[PDB]
């Protein structure tokens, strides 16, 4: 049906992009400061993925003022073909690297909390060092079709030089939509669907082990572990503390079930990673859903009024998805105690001198 050229929504979206740049440069730079200053054997298993996540966000945040200009100029790129190629490449590099850093953080919690294989093969620091190298190789290779296909051209008969994906090089005469639906679906799959499913499965197994809560005796100090149980007292290994018959007492001091305290493990790392995934899911979900509904709209012959709704909601969907870059340093300020303590350490000593 009828389709007009993409126009500017207002001054709201370009102003947010400038704010995300300002908060993202200083914010992610403060994250990279705290991790690299604390070297030696003091580094956490999660720190390697946090530092790379800060690198991915920082490099993309610098390209946002160029995109803020593009939005307000009603989608017209005045920075040339080279900057269009580099700016668009760093969007998808960030998209893949940030999603792979989150899976890395989630899998690091899986290997630590669940422990499927013995500590000999486990090698948490080695596995983290290998996966961080692979994710940077994967993100750079998966974002390469964006580096090649992007050019500054006059899309349709509209007098505007815009930064777009040119399929005239790879696609034939009719298979123009095939390459957009091909590279578009795979981008959402390897950049959001597959990563988010790994994060959720990792959390399901982590929750499965945490569910078996240990109980400590307040009288002597005996810790009942559901994994070990008490086979001598007629309690099979695997049985939960609540499932234990009421006649059972402490095998070391002989006190009833009422004198046992439930232990709530101080899992700080899990809390930091959970909030990072939750925010990422809330920021990236609308962008990927609207784009998929746009693909599955022209193919399934969806009503014309629905395509108009997706087009007007999309600039706001990309906006909040880009806010995610400057969102993490604020999340570490409210949930990560080690980041909080390291920032305050350079506050009293650094400024004084």
């Amino acid at each position: 049906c009828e389709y007009t050229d993409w126009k500017s929504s207002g001054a709201l979206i370009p102003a947010i992009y400038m704010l995300v740049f300002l908060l993202g440069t200083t914010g992610n730079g403060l994250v990279l400061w705290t991790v690299f200053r604390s070297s030696r054997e003091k580094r956490r298993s999660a720190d390697i993925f946090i530092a790379s996540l800060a690198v991915a966000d920082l490099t993309f945040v610098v390209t946002l003022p160029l995109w803020a200009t593009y939005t307000y100029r009603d989608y017209d790129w005045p920075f040339g073909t080279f900057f269009c190629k580099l700016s668009s490449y760093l969007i998808f590099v960030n998209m893949y690297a940030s999603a792979f850093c989150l899976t890395g953080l989630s899998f690091d919690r899986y290997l630590a909390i669940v422990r499927p294989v013995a500590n000999a093969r486990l090698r948490l620091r080695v596995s983290g060092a290998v996966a961080t190298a692979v994710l940077w190789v994967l993100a750079a290779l998966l974002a390469m079709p964006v580096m090649v296909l992007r050019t500054t051209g006059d899309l349709e008969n509209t007098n505007k030089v815009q930064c777009y994906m040119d399929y005239s090089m790879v696609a034939t005469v009719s298979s123009e939509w095939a390459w957009e639906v091909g590279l578009g679906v795979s981008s959402t799959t390897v950049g959001f669907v597959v990563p988010f499913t790994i994060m959720l499965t990792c959390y399901f197994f982590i929750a499965q082990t945490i569910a078996m809560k240990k109980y400590t005796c307040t009288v002597c100090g005996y810790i009942y572990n559901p994994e070990d149980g008490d086979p001598d007292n007629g309690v099979n290994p695997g049985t939960d503390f609540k499932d234990i018959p009421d006649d059972w007492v402490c095998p070391l001091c002989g006190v009833g079930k009422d004198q046992f305290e439930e232990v709530e493990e101080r899992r700080r790392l899990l809390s930091i990673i959970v909030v990072l995934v939750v925010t990422f899911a809330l920021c990236k979900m609308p962008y990927h859903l609207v784009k998929t509904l746009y693909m599955l709209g022209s193919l399934l012959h969806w009503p014309c009024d629905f395509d108009l709704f997706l087009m007007n909601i999309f600039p706001y969907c990309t906006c909040i998805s880009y806010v995610n870059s400057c969102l993490n340093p604020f999340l570490y300020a409210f949930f990560d105690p080690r980041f909080r303590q390291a920032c305050t350490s350079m506050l009293l000593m650094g400024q004084s001198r």
């Binding site: 017209d76 509209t158 007098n159």
Partner: peptide, 17 residues
Amino acid sequence: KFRRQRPRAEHKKXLPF
């Protein structure tokens, strides 16, 4: 330089992001 333009009809364009 930069200049604001009136809407023009066209084909289904792929999302600009």
